Design a protein around this ligand. Structure first.
Ligand SMILES: Cn1c(=O)n(CCCO)c(=O)c2c1nc(Oc1ccc(/N=N/c3ccccc3)c(Cl)c1)n2Cc1ccc(Cl)cc1
Ligand SMILES: Cn1c(=O)n(CCCO)c(=O)c2c1nc(Oc1ccc(/N=N/c3ccccc3)c(Cl)c1)n2Cc1ccc(Cl)cc1
Ligand SMILES: Cn1c(=O)n(CCCO)c(=O)c2c1nc(Oc1ccc(/N=N/c3ccccc3)c(Cl)c1)n2Cc1ccc(Cl)cc1
Lengths: 677, 44, 142, 676, 153, 43
């Protein structure tokens, strides 16, 4: 037996007052009209009867969109508090226009203003109605501001301060409002969406809300570009400078990947990319291969012509984007081929010469190594240090070029110090000629791996190269946990085995460590222990490394159980988890694979449009308006007109509330007919 | 006092969400029109 | 339906109180032995009514403690009355959502402080939320 | 400039008739009255107009459910053929009842009859109207009918014959038509669902449709059990014998898994399973663990008491299913423990004793061994051969007793023939004692693996064990491809290396093969080549087995390339492909894991319900009416009403619906305007 | 952490499989045990430079079947001094069947299960992490326990 | 001859399938509103 009773008692409503609410819904005017006329002198009933749910006299009329009755109650001087907000949310234009012709529980927070609520709805007609009468929106402060006004508000009421800012940005990011009161709608969406994404990181509490707003600004700019009907319209939009392809460049700066990947925008770029060959798309796959191979071979010939006679017909040939890409790639391809040839041409007798002179291959490589450094150095100035770090591929080019300078320094330095030939077996561990060779070989791996960035140009391999690269970030997080486990077990195993370290003189072949034919001293030092646990991930550490010379059966068993537990945690738990998180991340990435690849290829293409850097690495070392704005505003006017019509149609292409309205309309008509004679 | 306000705000929101179509609703519209027709025909 | 529940509750009404999760009450053993499938159904019917957000917001002294305690108890029934695990689990999710949605209507930092610092007999109410495993309530952005 | 024209032209419609067809949509009595009254005896025009899209006078009224214009048009003696089918499909009860009392283009195939179409729509009301009048449905022949009519009909028109059978089965599987006119709605749904499942296999071209019909029958029976409101009603349903728990036994036979897994049916079963322990569900986990150990450790006492005093108080405990289950499990564990004690007890001196006598452990274990054979023999005899093969675990049990028999026989032979003690190192390859020890050890693995079948009794292990068994069928299919790959590469590698075989005496330690410290002769014979390629999957074959004594560099390189290509196909392609197949398979199985596991546990529980076979194997061998139908029919009637009422309301909770509302207002507008 | 709970359920199946094959291999090889003195360097077991007596005792057999999961047990441990070809072949087939059931079947099924779990878990990761972080933060709100261990006393 | 019958069956089936929103709601509301004006102005 659990008795149930109203706990938070609320003042009840009289029977006659209750009939009024039915009277308000009744559809008759006299019953209310008599009450209001009698109420003025009688004082029997207050006109603004307050139902427990808070639907006062005005609100009940607005709910069903009854303008006739709404005006009936309106003229009697009934309460006019916050009824405009209820009308705006309802979206009944008639009620809003009529209303505009002028505790307290509310369903709206105190910061909501009529214009802000209208923008949240995205109703073009209602927003325009309120804009015609002068209105304003408060300007949001900067993301990172120590303003005295901003600081106090956060301290006084943190909850209200956060909600207010979100409400303001929802209004500002409304597509209908931007299309109405924005001078340059495309630029506004770019800036607004970028700012909304920055707030998605600082305001971590409501990151989901700000990302939804950011995505809605991105889609509006793309949808405005979808309305272009002619190639002239597209070119005017894409070449506009606020104060070539200037607007497209701004989109890349703000990461408008959907805007860039638009098919009509992509198709225009391909016309500039393939300038030399008008009918590239129609050509067969086999014919393309010969054409690309043919052009690459003449790359030295095309490059020289530009150097000597830039205005020559042949000289201008290397000025086209796609052909320049082939000439730059062909040059880099012969550099890599030469490195593969470095071993063959060397002679055995030179194996004993300390600090020899450069070889034939080294001489050939020399011009390009300098050219690579010069190219990277020049690129640093334009983009700045901050930009230079954004691209990982650019980071790799840094390591390869630094190592080449070190190889040159040591090779020359060894030339000065040493003069004769000595047996290489007698050289010290840190001989300059030995260190130089190691650094050169490390550069060769980096140089060859750099070729993978060229997969962006190809359409079959580009999307996969982009998807594989985006899986690496998730691998990086998983590497944090593995390092913790690797260090914990390395400390334990070294702590137990360092008592039994032996000397190389006592080992079978004078070899100490795990790189010997008979492995030993696997856990003698911490540096060796980390190496041993790394090599066990691939099964390259033998199980007899757990025995000690003096057979201590307890110590050997404990050490082997440490090794066994590490193997389970690594190869049966951690490795399998990384597979599962890889599978999850891949599935999400595939949805955006096409757009992400098209954004990457656009950057690759636009990097070949400018004249600077036309000569490949080997040859770049040789020493020898109001009218424009007027046309933009005309296309923008037509673009917005088509967008407004299209969305209105899309909306009308359902709900219980709609069912109620139809039911009331029949009842409203029914009452008049019966009363009507 | 605060719990009173939270309940009132919560109650109002859910009612709006509830009214925001099943087959049975279609029958009601048909029935409403049917009743109107009969009275008017009988009505002079 | 809030309106109909209030209409009946105005007229003095009652709902039977369910016996604890484990009870050897003589009525309890007799009912289960005499007719199972009716003892089990009646128990689920009473808990569905008590887990109603409208019946909790109205006629409950502390709507948020009721939701915490009720939701926790329904999860316990889910493990024991394993024959009808899903039904109890769905009811438990209902109570957790109602408490979080109640906290979603706070409009000032003052209101939030009063709710989360209330001691039924600092952050006392939040400590009760952690003890009952009210994760959505604790994870609310405000 | 493609020119577009009406390639397949049809006779046009006269202007006056176009308004009429619109008029028949309008609801104008005058034009129809004047038309026929102007044409019935003038003969100027035929009122049975045919719209180009197939619509006619009767159809247009039916579409909007306008009975008056429909009723108005019928009395004029207009054409009626196939009107009932359109009315039935529309599901307008008034239209149908109006038609019952009085090559062309049709939207229905010629085999469809009014009763079949009504059943396809599952409209309870319209079906009852037709059944009240005498109607019939042709009986579908068996799946494999050499009947002349079926043989002839299939040859004449296979397309028509196949569609006729499917149409008849869609009607016979209608829940409304089973709840009405079926003596036993639950039994009919069981048999129909099983037959439809078999039909799916035979007619491979229409497996999807027959599966859907089979699944719909299974749901109907489960929903009738959902309408039970008391425990008394539930027991009547599940214990009915058409001519204990007999009805539930029929459900297990037909694989009605959802029926058996219904929470109320499962609750009643748990009460019979936990007889001794009324409050097992509420008990703590620790007390639960302690309780079973007590029963397990007392099974020899419980078992003996049953034999001496079956009717005494201590004898009834081993009769309770859950206690009996614990007694059998404890007995099987002591046998397994004795198996692990065989190695420790043996003595060194006995090593060289050819054909020894049974040891202490073999004496203790022997009672179990005979019991296991006796138990499996009895189950096979009564169960039947076909039932035995259904369970995979049954196959493993048969092999376990086969090996245990061979071990006993061989040791018996060894004792009789061999007399003295000789060193083991001098024994031949196939000495009887050596074979007996090998066969005994193989059985031990099977005996321990048999324990996995007891996971079904556990609520945290059973669902996983059931999921694992289903992934095994996906693995089996992938094995066919691997075997062909393994055989193809084995033949190629052996065909290149059999010229360089060497003798064992010419090897380092006189060891030949891949199980020596220095592996050799890895591809000298086909039998060895298969082993080498198998052990390569686990990385246990070293790369130096590709070299030959006479250094033929070309031959060695080609052999190592065969080995490398086999490695890529096996460990990079096929193995990774098996992971992808399994990952998808687990997703599908996981959804139905709960129902599948509950069905498996029910068969286990019902295994311990029977009075026979209570004694565990160690002691398995030792010296020495019309009223029932009436109650079932009353309960079935109540269930049907609740089901029909629920579905009628549940159904009532499109473009055509929009037109009906639009038409209703327009009709009101026209009459009102005409009305003064 | 939430994935570890599903791995534990897999250990039950693997443990019983590991015990069934360890029992069989030990039951077949225990007649051919040798003494450490008779072995090359006086070392006995599978941790020696030349592994031996892999299946001589039950305790050692369990360790050998564990180390074969990681490929660290050589295949010649299936031979005996008195070369009984039938016995050696049966022991190698026991070892082979264990490898198939473990590394081809059981290990793959564990990958399939862990894949299903991660998808289900990922939907509530944010809520569960925030619950965990709240408990961590509240532990530092109390005045007690302020001093770290080294100054705790 | 067979193609003629196949096309006829297909056209009927798709039409039936097709007929089985806010724009629809607006159209329905117009009928009642227009009807009321005629009745109000009807003699
Ligand atoms: C990590 N580990 C290892 O290092 N070495 C190498 C030792 C030096 O050679 C081993 O030889 C070894 C090992 N782990 C092994 O199996 C298991 C298998 C399952 C287990 N728990 N399951 C659950 C616990 C809680 C809930 C559910 C399941 C534990 Cl705990 C161990 N074995 C084989 C083994 C060896 C000897 C004996 Cl007596 C028993 C087993
Ligand atoms: C099967 N195989 C093998 O048995 N041995 C052992 C030989 C005896 O020791 C090897 O040493 C070996 C090998 N397979 C190797 O790599 C590749 C990698 C990719 C390849 N195609 N990709 C594409 C074809 C068409 C479209 C796209 C991709 C082919 Cl074809 C081979 N290598 C290493 C290697 C060795 C020498 C040279 Cl020159 C090159 C590579
Ligand atoms: C477990 N196992 C093993 O231990 N050793 C080591 C022996 C001692 O060194 C092996 O050498 C070995 C092995 N398993 C092997 O392949 C298969 C492959 C598939 C199979 N069935 N598929 C299906 C059955 C029914 C339905 C569908 C598929 C069977 Cl049955 C065996 N092989 C290689 C091999 C060796 C000799 C001959 Cl004659 C044939 C094959």
């Amino acid at each position: 037996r659990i008795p149930l009773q109203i706990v938070r008692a609320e003042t009840e409503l009289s029977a006659e007052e209750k009939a009024f609410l039915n009277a308000v819904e009744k559809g008759d005017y006299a019953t209310v009209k008599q009450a209001l006329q009698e109420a003025e002198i009688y004082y029997n009933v207050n006109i603004n009867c307050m139902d427990p749910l808070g639907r006062s006299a005005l609100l009940i009329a607005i709910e069903n969109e009854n303008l006739e009755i709404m005006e009936l109650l309106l003229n009697h001087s009934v309460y006019v508090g916050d009824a405009l907000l209820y009308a705006i949310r309802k979206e009944v234009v008639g009620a809003v226009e009529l209303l505009l012709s002028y505790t307290q529980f509310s369903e709206f927070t105190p910061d909501i203003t009529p214009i802000m609520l209208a923008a949240h709805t995205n109703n073009y007609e209602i927003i325009k109605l309120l804009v015609q009468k002068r209105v304003t929106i408060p300007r949001p402060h900067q993301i990172r501001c120590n303003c005295v006004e901003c600081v106090s508000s956060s301290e006084v009421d943190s909850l209200r301060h956060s909600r207010s800012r979100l409400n303001i940005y929802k209004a500002l990011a409304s597509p209908s409002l931007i299309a109405l009161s924005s001078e340059d709608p495309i630029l506004t969406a770019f800036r607004l969406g970028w700012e909304l994404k920055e707030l998605s990181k600082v305001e971590n509490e409501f990151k989901a809300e700000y990302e939804e707003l950011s995505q809605q600004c991105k889609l509006f700019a793309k949808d405005l570009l979808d309305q272009a009907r002619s190639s002239r319209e597209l070119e005017i939009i894409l070449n506009h400078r606020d104060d070539d392809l200037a607007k497209l460049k701004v989109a890349i700066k703000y990461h408008q990947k959907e805007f860039v990947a638009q098919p009509n925008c992509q198709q225009l770029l391909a016309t500039l990319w393939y300038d030399g060959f008008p009918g590239w798309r129609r050509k067969h796959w086999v014919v393309k291969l010969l054409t690309c191979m043919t052009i690459g071979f003449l790359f030295p010939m095309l490059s020289i012509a530009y150097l000597i006679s830039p205005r020559s017909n042949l000289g201008l040939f290397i000025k086209k984007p796609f052909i320049k890409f082939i000439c730059h790639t062909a040059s880099y391809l012969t550099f890599l081929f030469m490195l593969l040839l470095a071993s063959q041409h060397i002679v055995r007798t030179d194996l004993h010469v300390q600090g020899p002179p450069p070889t034939v291959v080294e001489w050939m490589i020399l011009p390009w190594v300098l050219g690579f450094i010069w190219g990277e150095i020049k690129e640093m100035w334009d983009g700045g240090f901050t930009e230079y770090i954004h691209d990982w591929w650019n980071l790799m080019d840094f390591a390869m070029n630094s190592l080449y300078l070190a190889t040159i320094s040591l090779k020359i330095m060894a030339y000065v110090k040493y003069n004769g030939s000595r047996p290489r077996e007698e050289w010290e561990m840190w001989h300059p000629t030995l260190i130089a060779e190691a650094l050169f070989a490390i550069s060769n791996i980096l140089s060859s791996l750099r070729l993978i960035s060229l997969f962006t140009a190809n359409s079959h391999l580009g999307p996969l190269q982009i998807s594989l690269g985006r899986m690496l970030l998730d691998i990086l997080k998983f590497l944090f946990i593995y390092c913790l486990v690797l260090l914990a077990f390395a400390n334990g195993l070294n702590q137990l085995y360092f008592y039994y370290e032996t000397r190389a003189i006592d080992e079978p072949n004078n070899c100490k460590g795990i790189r010997c034919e008979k492995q030993n001293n696997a856990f003698s030092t911490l540096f060796e222990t980390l190496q041993s646990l790394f090599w066990s991930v691939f099964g390259l550490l033998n199980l007899y490394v757990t025995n000690v010379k003096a057979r201590h059966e307890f110590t050997e068993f404990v050490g082997a159980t440490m090794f066994g537990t590490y193997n389970v945690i690594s190869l049966v738990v951690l490795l399998n988890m990384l597979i599962a998180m890889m599978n999850n991340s891949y599935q999400l990435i595939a949805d955006h694979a096409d757009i992400e690849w098209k954004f990457a290829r656009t950057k690759l293409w636009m990097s070949y449009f400018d004249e600077g850097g036309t000569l490949p690495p080997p040859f770049n070392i040789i020493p020898s308006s109001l009218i424009q704005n007027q046309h933009y505003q005309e296309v923008i006017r037509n673009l917005v007109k088509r967008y407004v019509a299209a969305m209105i149609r899309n909306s009308k292409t359902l709900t219980e509330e709609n069912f109620k309205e139809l039911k009331q309309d029949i009842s409203s008509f029914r009452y008049e007919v019966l009363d009507l004679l």
